[PDB]
Design a protein around this ligand. Structure first.
Ligand SMILES: Nc1ncnc2c1ncn2[C@@H]1O[C@H](CSCC[C@H](N)C(=O)O)[C@@H](O)[C@H]1O
Ligand SMILES: Nc1ncnc2c1ncn2[C@@H]1O[C@H](CSCC[C@H](N)C(=O)O)[C@@H](O)[C@H]1O
Ligand SMILES: COc1ccc(-c2coc3cc(O)cc(O)c3c2=O)cc1
Ligand SMILES: COc1ccc(-c2coc3cc(O)cc(O)c3c2=O)cc1
Ligand SMILES: [K+]
Ligand SMILES: [K+]
Ligand SMILES: [K+]
Ligand SMILES: [K+]
Ligand SMILES: [K+]
Ligand SMILES: [K+]
Ligand SMILES: [K+]
Ligand SMILES: [K+]
Ligand SMILES: [K+]
Ligand SMILES: [K+]
Ligand SMILES: [K+]
Ligand SMILES: [K+]
Ligand SMILES: [K+]
Lengths: 353, 352
């Protein structure tokens, strides 16, 4: 402002407006999903013209241009590819899917539409209007502050959401499976592994099916693995990771450490190190979680990771940058580490004792 | 749908960015409600996190949450993070940027009121029901989700008056700034007619910036029915489709975007004769958005395409340069020139 060139001031105004109206990026995405446009295009078997698209959707004539404008914006953001014969005015444009919208085709193994609808649930998403009240409350999560209940209770009293939540879990399961396929260099030489905080063993199964020779122990709290049956190379063990971790060539901590403070992670890591360095053996600890690094990642990637650190903080979680991870490893008594890609948001970290 | 893993993961990252985009908006709203811009401004220099949370009186268990929000806002351009004096010893400090200087309440160009209004819970959540809206003939987004158009809503809920008025007040300041950067446009003009001039706010800004100019605020009879103007400002009621008062120049600010091409042609023709009578040859001035993916910066096109959607929710129709050009041609004009106005609007000079 101060004695700046109007152009500079107006450029800032535009930036302000982009962030102010950023929620429309979300709502437009949600709209495309609720309208089932990605599936309609998929069913069409080729790029679909605007006229055929609104005809199938049965869009009122006074709203056809609104649909076009929405499609244009979504296309700009990478969700559709506008196919049009330049230099042929009378001819309309067509909409083709992009990798991003193919991931929105309901019924497919990797479909992220469910995750999107869960995130954009009116009740949950609107809670972010009260970030101020939330930062002034000790310990409470954003939802505890805004809804008076935790996501678990919300899930229990919202069947629609619960249905989406479960679809989202299935899809994410397929994403991890896809991710695991390129990790042969990490797992292929192991004879045994323990998935610490493994839950219902979904991850352990993926690991076992991917690496048939590897034996896996799904380790979690007793009540979590309570009446689960292990089969061929996959077994369940109940316990407390802070007290003791089952011995193995490697330990896996997937989406576990981001739920704990630095002090607790160090303790967890120490127990895991213990688990892979007994009987005169020297294995390794594998951590699958987000690694923030503004120096190594592309600016657009750092942006979503930073965004995610904010969102998870709302549920008292924490994403860490590489230096922070390094600190933890050193404090836990490890000698070195290596980071590799896992998914577009999570990385795989190998920690050596 | 056989894609490479890397393609799939990049697409997932893209999806997460868009589904969580509303947080960009909410974190911005948060910084304003926390008066962070003002706190940094008053400090007179970059503020350390410790000093910031101290002034804010943030509970110890949420200090890192505030840190993550500031880090994200900084990345998006609202703050500059300054590193510590010692190595190994983290304390960053936060400095304002041009974007956040616009969020410092009390300053002349503050846009915080605009943000607070747009991001009002009741108003902003209407966007959750875009589907219902596109299946309704003619209704605006607000009419469909609030039950009535925004004007009626404000009448029924007076509390939103100070919010809306203040937002409009911040926008006029942007207009005033823009107007003072348009000397070359109003140079040589003795008279101007603001067609669809509304209450005269724009005309007042024009006359004040150019005491040399005389302006006629032209609008529907009932719009200027009981309005009084200054010595260089007067009001005239009528219908632009029927007849537009003569003058050296005609101004159409945020008018053409709410009419179909056919009606714009009608208006533009009436404006043409308005500045080409009595053997004189003036020009028509249009202030509205001009979309151009070929000449605009990527980020500018981004917001214009977004605003293209938001404006349509109120039945507005923004146009790209090619479309504007075609309307000017069919209207009988010979040439045009587009100049910078504000961040999202341009100023087009049309020559008959
Ligand atoms: N002391 C403890 N010992 C073992 N598991 C624990 C634990 N405290 C919490 N957990 C487990 O932490 C897990 C966090 S969810 C972890 C995610 C999971 N590995 C995945 O791939 O989705 C839960 O399954 C929870 O029961
Ligand atoms: N036939 C007509 N003649 C003159 N003004 C008209 C009109 N039909 C609609 N309008 C006017 O169109 C205007 C659109 S909004 C005007 C905004 C104004 N130029 C600004 O810069 O803020 C309204 O003031 C409305 O009264
Ligand atoms: C620690 O793992 C987690 C736990 C919770 C989230 C999470 C964060 O923000 C949200 C916002 C919404 O509007 C709706 C949601 O449904 C969520 C989540 O589920 C993200 C990662
Ligand atoms: C060009 O004129 C216009 C017409 C409409 C708008 C506009 C667009 O989206 C909004 C969204 C909200 O949540 C609240 C609002 O209050 C608005 C507006 O006022 C902005 C400028
Ligand atoms: K400057
Ligand atoms: K296609
Ligand atoms: K699905
Ligand atoms: K408060
Ligand atoms: K919660
Ligand atoms: K125990
Ligand atoms: K994580
Ligand atoms: K780092
Ligand atoms: K919202
Ligand atoms: K309206
Ligand atoms: K009402
Ligand atoms: K416009
Ligand atoms: K264009």
């Amino acid at each position: 402002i101060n004695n700046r060139k109007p152009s500079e001031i107006f450029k800032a105004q535009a930036l302000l407006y982009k962030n102010m109206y950023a929620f429309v990026d979300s709502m437009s995405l949600k709209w495309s999903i609720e309208m089932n446009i990605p599936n309609i295009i998929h069913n069409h078997g080729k790029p679909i013209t605007l006229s055929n698209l609104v005809s199938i959707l049965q869009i009122p004539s006074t709203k056809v241009d609104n649909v076009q404008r929405l499609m244009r914006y979504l296309a700009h953001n990478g969700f559709f590819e506008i196919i049009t014969n330049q230099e042929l005015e009378n001819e309309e444009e067509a909409y083709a899917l992009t990798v991003a919208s193919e991931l929105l085709v309901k019924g497919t193994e990797l479909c992220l539409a469910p995750m999107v609808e869960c995130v954009l649930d009116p009740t949950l998403s609107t809670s972010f209007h009260n970030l101020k009240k939330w930062v002034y409350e000790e310990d409470l999560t954003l939802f505890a502050v805004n809804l008076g209940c935790d996501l678990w209770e919300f899930l229990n009293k919202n069947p629609e959401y619960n249905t989406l939540y479960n679809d989202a879990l299935a899809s994410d399961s397929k994403m991890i499976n896809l991710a695991m396929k390129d990790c042969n260099l990490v797992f292929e030489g192991l004879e045994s592994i323990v998935d610490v905080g493994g839950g219902n063993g979904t991850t352990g199964k993926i690991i076992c099916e991917t690496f048939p020779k590897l034996t896996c122990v799904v380790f979690d709290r007793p009540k979590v693995v309570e009446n689960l049956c292990g089969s061929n190379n996959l077994t369940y063990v109940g316990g407390d990771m802070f007290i003791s971790v089952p011995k193995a060539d490697a330990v896996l901590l997937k989406a576990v450490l981001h739920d704990w403070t630095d002090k607790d992670c160090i303790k967890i890591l120490k127990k895991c190190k213990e688990a892979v360095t007994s009987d005169g053996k020297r294995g390794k600890v594998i951590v699958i979680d987000m690694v923030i690094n503004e120096k190594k990642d592309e600016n657009q990637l750092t942006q979503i990771k930073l965004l995610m650190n904010v969102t998870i903080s709302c549920v008292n979680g924490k994403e860490r940058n590489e230096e922070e991870w390094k600190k933890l490893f050193i404090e836990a008594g490890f000698q070195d580490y290596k980071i590799s890609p896992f998914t577009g948001l999570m990385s795989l970290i190998e920690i050596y004792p």
